From a paper:
Relaxases are DNA strand transferases responsible for the initial and final stages of DNA processing during bacterial conjugation, a mechanism of DNA transfer between bacterial cells. [name] is the relaxase of the prototype plasmid R388. It is a relaxase of the MOBF family, presently composed by 114 members and including relaxase TraI of plasmid F. [name] presents two domains: relaxase and helicase. The relaxase domain is responsible for DNA recognition; it shows extremely high specificity towards its cognate nic-site.
Deeper analysis of the ssDNA region of the nic-site focused on the U-shaped turn located close to the catalytic site, which is conserved in the nic-site of the related plasmid F. We solved the X-ray structure of a [name] nucleoprotein complex containing a nic-site mutant efficiently processed by [name] that carries a different combination of nucleotides in the U-shaped turn. Nic-site mutants III, IV and V, are still efficiently transferred although they present 3–4 mutations around the cleavage site, affecting the nucleotides involved in the U-shaped structure. Moreover, although all previous [name] structures were obtained with selenomethionine derivatives of TrwCR, we were able to obtain native crystals with TrwCR-mutant IV. The main difference revealed by the new structure was the formation of a different U-shaped structure, in which the formation of three hydrogen bonds between G22C and T25G in TrwCR-IV stabilize the U-turn shape DNA structure. In the IV mutant, both Lys262 and Ser89 interact now with G25 and Lys262 with T24. These protein–DNA interactions together with maintenance of the T23 interactions with the protein and the Watson–Crick base pairing between C22 and G25 allows the formation of the U-shape structure in TrwCR-IV. In the three dimensional (3D) structure of the TrwCR–MIV complex, there is an obvious new interaction, a triple hydrogen bond between C22 and G25 that makes the structure resemble in size and charge distribution of the U-shaped turn of the wt complex. In all MOBF structures, T23 is extruded from the extended ssDNA by its tight binding to the relaxase. The mutant IV containing scDNA is slightly less prone to in vitro relaxation by [name] than the scDNA containing the wt nic-site, although [name] can still relax mutant IV scDNA. [name] is able to cleave a mutant IV-containing oligonucleotide RIV(25 + 18).
Residue numbers in the entry: 1 to 19, 33 to 293
The structure:
DNA sequence: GCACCGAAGGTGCGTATTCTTG
């Protein structure tokens, strides 16, 4: 799955609460950002502070409006893949998943644009450079093994005149449906090369064959809570509405109890084999 | 494309929609 969200001022904390971590992009490499992410410098980049002796971006933003600090492209991996990576503990699947993200974001990067006004007439220009902060997370709200990566695309791209202008967001936003598959297709290719058998269902989606549905929803409690949400309120999973579909975006909440993780994975392991799950 | 940002021109706005649920 590719979950997206355009990021504003209201979110800057939760945006920083995203710290395993890597930079990616032509926009990042030109600003000299390589290797892991620095929390102080990432928040500087969210806020508009590029540094390197240049002004602060998005000065020409209107004040009635929300200052959007970037775009969150979350690459959420299927359940069966999370279990073989987090419960079995396979680094190869962790490493396969990062590549699906990285190769998908390169196509997102190819779709980067910004606007240039020359004598009162705006021009759209495809820049093809992005400044992305990627953060690999391993759990979910109900702390089910849930591999997902936050691709924070910073609201900046360098133009051909050498300037840092805000990214034109459109052709990335309206390509989320495509990029969700590009992540599907890359990850499927990688697992297929590791010797893993895949079973298919719904949209191009797939699970490992040794992990059937029988033991998937056991680890999909967060989905059981979503499924029970609409079922309480007398409504189908499939015949929902856009926003009304996010009626579970929160309200299926739990307590974010900070827990030890070593004893959790042994819980995973025992909750796995209790479903007879064979990691083969 | 507009209407307000701010110092020239540049900007959010809106866009989005799988399931495993950010």
């Amino acid at each position: 799955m590719l979950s997206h969200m355009v990021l504003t001022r209201q979110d800057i904390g939760r945006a920083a609460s995203y710290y395993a971590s890597e930079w990616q992009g032509k926009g990042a490499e030109e600003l000299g950002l390589s290797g892991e992410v620095d929390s102080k410098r990432f928040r500087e980049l969210l806020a508009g502070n590029i540094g390197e002796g240049h002004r602060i971006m998005r000065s020409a933003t209107r004040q009635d409006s929300k200052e959007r600090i970037g775009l969150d492209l979350t690459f959420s991996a299927p359940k069966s893949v999370s279990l073989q990576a987090l419960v079995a503990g396979d680094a190869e699947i962790i490493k396969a998943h990062d590549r699906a993200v990285a190769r998908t974001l390169e196509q997102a990067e190819a779709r980067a644009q910004a606007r240039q006004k020359i004598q009162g007439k705006t021009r759209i220009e495809t820049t093809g450079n992005l400044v992305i902060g990627k953060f690999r997370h391993e759990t979910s709200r109900e702390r089910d093994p849930q591999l997902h990566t936050h691709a924070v695309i910073l609201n900046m791209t360098k133009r051909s005149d050498g300037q840092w202008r805000a990214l034109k967001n459109d052709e990335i936003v309206k390509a989320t449906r495509y990029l969700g598959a590009v992540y599907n297709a890359e990850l499927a290719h990688e697992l297929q090369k590791l010797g893993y058998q895949l079973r298919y269902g719904k949209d191009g989606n797939f699970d490992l064959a040794h992990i059937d549905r029988q033991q998937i929803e056991g680890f999909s409690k967060r989905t059981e809570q979503i499924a029970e949400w609409y079922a309480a309120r007398g409504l189908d999973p499939n015949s929902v509405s856009l926003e009304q579909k996010q009626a579970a975006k929160v309200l299926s909440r739990a307590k974010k109890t900070s827990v030890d993780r070593e004893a959790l994975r042994a819980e995973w392991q025992a909750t796995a084999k209790e479903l007879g799950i064979d990691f083969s």
